[PDB]
């Protein structure tokens, strides 16, 4: 889906499989968190479906020894003194000692400030213990979490439930057309993007000899040249757009191991799973009712949440019993207008825009004379069209697909291309769609705050600030204090401070809230980037102090108050909203759950040959399953005729469904339901 989903998948630890355990043979004890998982397997990142606990992600600093156990680094404490000597310990090796928590108060020399410190012991015991008892201590605060989990800012303010969903949905982000790095970060985004392997890093130091959208050439110091080719508009495994773009220009000195070009979901070498959106926390006319989302139409006009998606379509020409399937432009009983987008071979041409139902590859298959309907043979006689022994089996665009044809690949047995035995030609057509954000597309943040797009108002309808800048997204307030994900509120505050900047009062010394902050943080420019490391990072005392000294706009006016709220205007009436509203910037990701894929409907279509019931799945153009519980609901209502209608003429009544379709096109009444063919099969099976 995105580079993070690939990196996480490579670091997955699965209990299922041969030699492990069966899903039916796994109780509630194999799946829950174990105290030995500290710093080895993440206690947050795991699916919430039937594979919960059975699939984990390796911790960041964890590694595997040649025996098979997972080692994690620790700082060896000599005599109550923290040392920079680091040693990896296995699980039972960790139990033979006691380790101090990473955030322990430590002297500049290394001695613990408190005699009693929070210390983990064997069998999952946490307690205070003398400073002369600490044998080791943790490397980093984020030592216990996975890479994706370490990417959630203010993670210490989110419950484990929404934190799990936040890390699981970060892997579901969609690579947008252009990518923006988040204002509020954690620092992990850089190493996560580089180690993922979807960027282009320079192997050796040198200068850029030639740079193009196709390739980058680097002239090394010794004299050799290495050229890196860009992967442009390539389809990923899940239909997302993998597109690399050069960053450096001509004649730029670049060191070794530096990002000279970045791919999907990357901005200057950092994981850009979404965009920075101006958010207001307020109910708005019910359009954001429990987890619904209201969006500014600016995100559509400016392609902020627009993403590229590529689908692969394939068909082959085989040898049949009565001849051979041939790919040709000549298709029986088709106008010259539908075939207008095809070349002389019967293939759609590059660049042609195709809707659903359009022909992609024109293939005809010879059908025998003894296979003809009596009406079809009469219909063939009353049109005088002889020599049409072939029928239409062309590759058409599926329902719900539309875009530009970007590439064609043809494989022919005639041209030395080795196809499976019985095939004469193979064609693959790549169609790319440019998907803007739509009503119902599923957006989400980094704190498990998810929701579908309920309404995209015009830019003038949106509540706008004092200087006329309208907000981009309106998040409902009710769905905030239930989920216990205050991190989104703290991200919104810090998000605005990064957008505007700040200046701490230097006169009369450094204030008492910014004493712990580094000197690099005392002054900030607009659109500055910051890091909030997991279990470290910004504290609420410093965040409250930053809101008080937010930088003014170009007019010199401070829009948001020290509380973090700002005065908004109702764009539909003009009257200002009666109370100030929390307004800031939040990092929103476009998840791979779009209505363009998830919409489906069916009148009739294919039926399973055995049960004579409609097919399943959208790809097979099947119908929905009126399950067992749904039949109980019909009977509870007393809707007998609706129930008989669902289970007969609308499903597996072979003659009833056809006579119903005729009764509809004739305008007649719906006929009487017959006997289900599935019940006939049950009897023939009991026999």
């Amino acid at each position: 889906n995105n580079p993070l989903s690939g990196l996480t998948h490579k670091r997955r630890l699965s209990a299922l499989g041969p030699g492990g355990l069966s899903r039916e043979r796994a109780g509630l004890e194999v799946r829950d968190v174990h105290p030995s998982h500290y710093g080895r397997m993440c206690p947050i990142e795991t699916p919430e479906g039937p594979n919960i606990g059975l699939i984990g992600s390796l911790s960041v600093y964890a590694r595997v020894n040649p025996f098979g156990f997972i080692e994690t680094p620790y700082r060896k404490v000599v005599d109550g003194v923290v040392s920079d000597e680091i040693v990896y310990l296995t699980a039972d090796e960790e139990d033979r000692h006691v380790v101090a928590q990473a955030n322990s108060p430590i002297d500049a020399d290394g001695r613990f400030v408190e005699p009693r410190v929070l210390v983990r012991r064997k069998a999952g015991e946490v307690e205070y213990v003398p400073s002369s008892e600490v044998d080791y201590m943790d490397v980093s605060p984020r030592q216990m979490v996975s890479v994706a989990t370490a990417m959630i800012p203010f993670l210490e303010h989110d419950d484990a439930n929404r934190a799990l969903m936040g890390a699981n949905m970060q892997r579901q982000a969609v690579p947008l057309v252009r990518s923006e790095a988040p204002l509020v970060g954690t620092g992990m985004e850089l190493r996560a993007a580089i180690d993922a392997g979807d960027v282009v890093v320079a192997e050796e130091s040198g200068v850029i000899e030639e740079v193009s959208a196709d390739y980058i050439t680097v002239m090394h110091d010794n004299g050799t040249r290495r050229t890196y080719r860009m992967r442009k508009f390539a389809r990923s495994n899940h239909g997302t757009c993998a597109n690399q773009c050069p960053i450096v220009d001509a004649g730029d000195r670049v060191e070794a191991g530096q990002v000279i070009a970045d791919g999907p979901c990357t901005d200057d070498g950092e994981m850009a799973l979404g965009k920075n959106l101006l958010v207001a926390i307020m109910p708005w006319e019910g359009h954001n009712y429990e987890d619904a989302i209201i969006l500014s139409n600016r995100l559509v006009e400016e392609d902020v949440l627009t993403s590229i998606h590529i689908e692969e379509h394939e068909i082959d020409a085989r040898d049949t019993k009565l001849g051979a399937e041939e790919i040709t432009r000549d298709i029986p009983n088709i106008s010259d207008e539908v075939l207008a987008d095809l070349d002389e071979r019967g293939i759609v041409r590059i660049g042609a825009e195709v809707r659903d139902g359009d022909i992609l590859v024109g293939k005809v298959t010879p059908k025998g004379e003894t296979e003809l309907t009596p009406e079809e043979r009469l219909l063939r006689a009353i049109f005088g069209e002889k020599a049409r022994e072939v029928r239409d089996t062309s590759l058409k665009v599926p329902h719900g697909e539309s875009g530009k044809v970007i590439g064609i690949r043809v494989f022919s047995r005639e041209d030395e291309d080795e196809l499976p035995a019985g095939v004469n030609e193979l064609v693959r057509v790549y169609v790319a769609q440019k998907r803007k954000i739509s009503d119902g597309d599923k957006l989400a943040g980094r704190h498990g705050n998810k929701g579908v797009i309920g309404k995209i108002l015009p830019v003038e309808d949106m509540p706008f600030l004092a200087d006329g800048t309208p907000v981009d997204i309106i998040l409902n307030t009710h769905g905030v204090p239930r989920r216990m994900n205050i991190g989104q509120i703290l991200e919104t505050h810090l998000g605005w401070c990064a957008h505007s900047g700040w200046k701490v009062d230097a006169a009369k010394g450094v204030p008492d809230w910014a004493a712990r902050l580094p000197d690099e943080l005392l002054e900030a420019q607009p659109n500055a980037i910051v890091s909030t490391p997991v279990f470290d990072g910004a504290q609420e005392a410093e965040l409250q102090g930053l809101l008080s000294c937010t930088l003014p706009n170009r007019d010199g006016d401070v829009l948001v108050d020290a509380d973090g709220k700002a005065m908004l205007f109702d764009g539909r009436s003009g009257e200002p909203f009666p109370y100030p509203v929390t307004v800031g910037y939040m990092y929103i990701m476009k998840l791979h759950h779009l209505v363009d894929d998830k919409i489906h409907a069916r009148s009739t279509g294919p039926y399973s040959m055995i049960t004579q019931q409609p097919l399943g799945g959208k790809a097979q153009f099947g119908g929905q399953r009126f399950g067992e519980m749904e039949c109980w609901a019909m009977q509870a209502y007393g809707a007998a005729y609706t129930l008989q209608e669902l289970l007969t003429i609308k499903s597996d009544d072979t003659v009833g469904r056809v006579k119903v379709y005729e009764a509809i096109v004739k305008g007649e009444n719906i006929p009487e339901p017959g006997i289900p063919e599935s019940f006939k099969v049950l009897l023939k099976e009991l026999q």
């Binding site: 960041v60 600093y61 490397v139 620092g187 850089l190 190493r191 690099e520 980037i529 890091s531 990072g537």
Partner: peptide, 23 residues
Amino acid sequence: SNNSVPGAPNRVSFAKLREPLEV
């Protein structure tokens, strides 16, 4: 500064604890 090893953009960290071992 945060991650001043590959030549990346300068992201400023709210870090009170030093990183003894790099990822």
